[PDB]
Each structure stands twice: as structure tokens, then as C-alpha cells.
């Protein structure tokens, strides 16, 4: 949004369970590279368990081995960072200019908050 924060780095950990991420590490194999997996469990916030959506395999990858993926408008997302982090949102529209998205909070008393400028790195495709 209209923030004087030139850096959108809220928290260095962004791994939340029940989100889809893309494996950009290739460390476990190319069969896992650029593939989509769901976080089954986060261990130490910087490390999480991802179950391959396609392969079905259970992997143990660090945040640096994973990348947040952004769905289409109308889909649910999990906001990972910011003052809304931990909440669920619906993707309204994306801003590829700032690499951010417009999401509306769908959880708690914050439900109904359509907040814009949420970086693709601060949200994830909800499982």
C-alpha cells in the first residue's frame, strides 16, 4: 500500500503450513525443480516439509529451497508476512509492476480488509 517502506522484508521466515510453493533448489533432483509442493509442516520456520503435489513425495526443504507461488484472482492465499501474516486472504488482483498482489482478509476481525501491495513473497497459494 502507501507505505514509506522501500523494503518489504517483514520477517525472514515465510514458511507456513498448508501453502503451495515451488521448488527452485533442484538439490533433491530435477524432478523436483520448478515443481509445486504443499507445506505439510514447518520445523523451524526457515525449514519446512513439502509434499509434492505432482509426485506425492514428502520432502524436507529450507525456505531457500522453496519459492512462494501466486494463484489466480478469486483464489485463496495465505499471507505469510506483514501485519496480516497468518491470516487467509482472497486474491483480488495482482500488480506485476511492484510484484505484489491485492488480497482481502478472510479470517478473524480482519476479514474484509482488502489490502494492496502485498508482495508475492509475502503471500502464497493456499492449499
From Swiss-Prot:
It comes from the Eukaryota. Residues 18-68 are annotated as: C-terminal subdomain A. It is found in: Nucleus; Cytoplasm. Induction: By UVC irradiation in quiescent primary fibroblasts. By mitomycin C in human melanoma MeWO cells. Changing residue 125 to E: Significant reduction of RNA-binding activity. Ubiquitously expressed in all tissues examined, with highest levels in skeletal muscle, heart and testis. Differentially expressed in non-tumorigenic and tumorigenic cell lines. Highly expressed in proliferating epithelial keratinocyte cells in vitro (at protein level). Residues 74-125 are annotated as: C-terminal subdomain B. The C-terminal domain (268-393) is organized into 2 subdomains that bear structural similarities to SH3-like domains. Both subdomains adopt a similar 5-stranded beta-barrel-like fold and are connected to each other by a short linker of 5 residues. The 5 beta-sheets are packed at approximately right angles against each other. A highly conserved groove formed at the interface between the 2 subdomains, comprised of Lys residues 302 and 391 and other positively charged residues, may possibly be the site of RNA-binding. Belongs to the KIN17 family. Recognized by antibodies directed against the RecA protein. Associated with DNA polymerase alpha, RFC1 and cyclin A, in multiprotein DNA replication complexes. Also associates with replication origins at the G1/S phase boundary and throughout the S phase in vivo. (Microbial infection) Interacts with SV40 large T antigen. This is DNA/RNA-binding protein KIN17. The gene is KIN. The chain holds residues 268 to 393 of 393 of the full protein.
Amino acid at each position: 500500500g502507501e507505505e514509506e517502506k522501500k523494503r518489504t522484508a517483514r520477517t525472514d521466515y515465510w514458511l507456513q503450513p498448508e501453502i503451495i510453493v515451488k521448488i527452485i533448489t533442484k538439490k533433491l533432483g530435477e524432478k523436483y525443480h520448478k515443481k509445486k509442493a504443499i507445506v505439510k509442516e514447518v520445523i523451524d520456520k526457515y525449514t519446512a516439509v513439502v509434499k509434492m503435489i505432482d509426485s506425492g513425495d514428502k520432502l524436507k526443504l529450507d525456505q531457500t529451497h522453496l519459492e512462494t507461488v501466486i494463484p489466480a484472482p478469486g483464489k485463496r492465499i495465505l499471507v505469510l508476512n506483514g501485519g496480516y501474516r497468518g491470516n487467509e486472504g482472497t486474491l483480488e488482483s495482482i500488480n506485476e509492476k511492484t510484484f505484489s498482489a491485492t488480497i482481502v482478509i478472510e479470517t478473524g476481525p480482519l476479514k474484509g480488509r482488502r489490502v494492496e501491495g502485498i508482495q508475492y513473497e509475502d503471500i502464497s497459494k493456499l492449499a
